Amino acid sequence: FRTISNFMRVSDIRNKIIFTLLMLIVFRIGTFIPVPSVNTDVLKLQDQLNAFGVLNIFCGGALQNFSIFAMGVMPYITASIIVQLLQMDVVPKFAEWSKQGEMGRRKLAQFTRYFTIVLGFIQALGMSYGFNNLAGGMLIQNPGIGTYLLIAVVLTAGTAFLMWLGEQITAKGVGNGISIIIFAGIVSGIPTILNQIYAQTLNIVRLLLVALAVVAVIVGVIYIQQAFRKIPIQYAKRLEGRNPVGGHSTHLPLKVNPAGVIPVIFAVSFLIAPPTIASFFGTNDVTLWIRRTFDYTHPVGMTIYVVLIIAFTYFYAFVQVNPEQMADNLKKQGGYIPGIRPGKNTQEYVTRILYRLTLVGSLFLAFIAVLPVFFVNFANLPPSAQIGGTSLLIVVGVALETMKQLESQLVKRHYRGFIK
């Protein structure tokens, strides 16, 4: 295409594209490096398929990885969503820190980094112990607590290195940092999944139907993700004379899916917590029943999963948008929806807008989240695929946002002038 040749003609855009690709090569290089005392052959023997590499296994229908980047930035994700939930009328110090401005925000960012290190340590301990139980105690050689804390501190060092790499690739690179690293994790898992689907193989036309359905779902995801309900906003603090246009008018855009993917975080925590607390109690009748009904590849568990995605989309849409804080900010800065009094009436106006938009966005999110179950069941795919889950939403969003960032860097060169 012409536009990717226009990018490489500007030197700054090409400079940060090449820096981003070098940081992704660094991330992949580190994903090949094993952990200290983890005895890689029993790890590579644990899988149910044949992945590429020795640290990549196909466990639980997912491409698991046990390098020094085994956690990825997942502790940063869960630390940020916990800190964000704590800002909203639970911990008061965080509330006033958010209320301060761009310096109390730095206090919240510092707390999120320290909480990231703490949660990365706890997750690395749980992950190494659970993987060692999965291998039968054979995964860790010398299973003493000094070796577990060595493994935990090196996985936490890997995750903190990935966060530094994200800071680099957002300072000197193409876009957001952590989002590019998450995108890299997903689409670096893609080629071995394609190799498994090839190593499996009416089937050629079945995979052609699957690829056409994947392009159809990518089009539907772009359609919902790029759609805003634009509420018009009128400001009554400038004279606005001399024929105001009306084309670039001020508005307040609400997304159709304002929550994002975070409702699936809350729904899968609600779906994994009963099997772990039943796994601590040993095998019984009710332990096996809890394990059988909270498994979302079977219709009772899929129904509980869909219901929790819809309910947590409503909760997190009203957490993310917060129509009361929106109405107060609109009243304070002097704007108003035309026709609606700027106090409580705009709060309940945009509350009604948010109820309807959140219904459509929650149904889209639940359908996207239970799509890979249907592709695996009704396309005879291997269960390794997870083809069209919320990783599809993450991939589409990061691709489109990086493209928009690049075109915004591009247009600063094209200031024409009437003389030319």
């Binding site: 401005g101 603090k237 004279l239 004379g241 670039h248 304070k332 247009v411």
Partner: protein, 765 residues
Amino acid sequence: RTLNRYEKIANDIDAIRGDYENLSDDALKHKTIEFKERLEKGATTDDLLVEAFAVVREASRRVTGMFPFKVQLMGGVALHDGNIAEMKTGEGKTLTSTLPVYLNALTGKGVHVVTVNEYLASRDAEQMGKIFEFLGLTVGLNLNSMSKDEKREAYAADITYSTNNELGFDYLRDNMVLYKEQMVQRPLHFAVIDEVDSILIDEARTPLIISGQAAKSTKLYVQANAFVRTLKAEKDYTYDIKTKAVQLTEEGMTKAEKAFGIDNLFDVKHVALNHHINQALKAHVAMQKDVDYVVEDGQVVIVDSFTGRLMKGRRYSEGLHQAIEAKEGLEIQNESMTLATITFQNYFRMYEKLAGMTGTAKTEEEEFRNIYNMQVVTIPTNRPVVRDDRPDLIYRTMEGKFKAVAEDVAQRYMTGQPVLVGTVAVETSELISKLLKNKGIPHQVLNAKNHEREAQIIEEAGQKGAVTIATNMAGRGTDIKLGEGVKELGGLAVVGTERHESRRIDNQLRGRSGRQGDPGITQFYLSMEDELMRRFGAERTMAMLDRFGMDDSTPIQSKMVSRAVESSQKRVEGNNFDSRKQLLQYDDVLRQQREVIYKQRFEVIDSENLREIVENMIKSSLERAIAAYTPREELPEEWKLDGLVDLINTTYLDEGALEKSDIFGKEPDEMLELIMDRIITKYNEKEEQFGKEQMREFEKVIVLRAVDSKWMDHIDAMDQLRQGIHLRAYAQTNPLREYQMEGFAMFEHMIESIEDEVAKFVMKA
């Protein structure tokens, strides 16, 4: 390390000032001629630095009696390098300005010495102009009251002393001229900015804006002022003390809709009434009379927030000045209309070399590194600071604080030590003057209203037994000299009465006391209902002022109130930091647009033939008119080409000269070339009949009028966009990127309109 370099160069200057001493005048005035021809043959200013500085040292000892110390030479070398010389208050920064100003005015391109107000500019211009006119250069002083010819003579001199407002407004008015010979300024070459942190940090929060008067309305101002004057300060409006925002309550909105006969105040047909009600609220509640303005000769005159003096030409924007004039019962003037805008960052970053000196730079050092690429260099003092900075005396009420201040001033007046009390507003200064009137203490007051006697008051303010109450006017650059016996009493006790918006500003007040190794006391008397504590104090510590009791004869001897005072001042400093950062990046967008427009408008002005410029404008307008019809999609004859023929005959080619047959079935570029060569021969007939230079005058007027009108509309539309852009941040975008993209689209549509207007007005006239 650069400070050892500055010490080395200062010792070099010391050796050769040993050499330069026994030279007559006319042999020391000849050194300027010698340096000018050596600077024209092959030398640079950096090679001439030690001989030029030794010549200025000797000339200064011959004229003013002052022979600059070696720390003044170190500050002069730090100013020649383009850095910021942070010499302390009282140290002698005016002579250290005269060293690199002489060195950099030898090339003939002009040096601007910028100061904060016109008292300091005229004072420094007089003394240091005596030095420079001994040496043989020419010193102009650019004031607000001069005409354009006197301003052109001031900028044509070798060294020009002005304030930052006049330099900014002269730049903005030079890009609104019609002839090149109406510009007063020369190309901008070197600026030595005295009090850099006032000008480049504090006052850089604001833009300079040249307006021109629009049509007058008056009935809605009197109507909204008569409404707001009956409005019950707690039921019908809330005044937010933190950010001084006055808003109606729902009871007040109901009363507004009843008083004006409307049904909804928040419609889109009542946006003018809502604007007038809001500006009458701000004029009544948030704009107090002797704090924010004054009424002089039936006019509302703005008291400047930084300099503390009256800004005579300046008026409040967006109808606030007219609401204040309706509030005060004065004659309501016309509206205004922004013609030009610049910020002080974007003005002083045009200057090819920028230096500066101040007393209080080090805390803002990284800001000076991030924007201006200037490095704060700290200079020693040559005599230690013997000034006594006592800690603040915090009180419960303002009446107890002011009783304490008057008691302190009374017991320092009894010994004979001169006192300088430092307030901020004009009304608190008159309050403390009447607090010393009874108690029988003879004083002087230096308000914004008492600016005529200022140079007299400062000459008596350091005598024996001299009380001076002074607002922000005094505490920035004022040099109070001590009288006889006053240095034995520990002369000039400065008694501040409030914390300012930074530590730099109250350090400048203390610097009024210090003054190069002389003794001096600086006591601040704060209060707990001071405006800094009421507006920015945290609500925890604002609860126990009942715990401290209600007496106010002795100060609060706590350590939780001192932490509250310091944290409130740091909160103001952080707010101002972020506000000036925001103004910086959004005026970087408008800076790129303004630099393009102003450069091309200037080369419209000094172009002795405009045929190529106007023809490229007509061709660009014509290409867009061709491509507005004739799109890429519907190629075979769904192209509506008689509409295009009608457009060409209404815009370019005099009503009959094109039919459908001339452009039927043609490629867009060949019909463009056909219409374009018809336009060229029509232009050649116009240039033949109309004249040759008369045609250039005609289309220069057309082009400049189009550029000016569309650029004023673009400044307005760009302001409206910057109003709504944080609301764009509600949709999880970066709002600065949205501002940049919509500003680019708006700018390019503006230039298309310029080309369309110039094409139509040239071809159809």
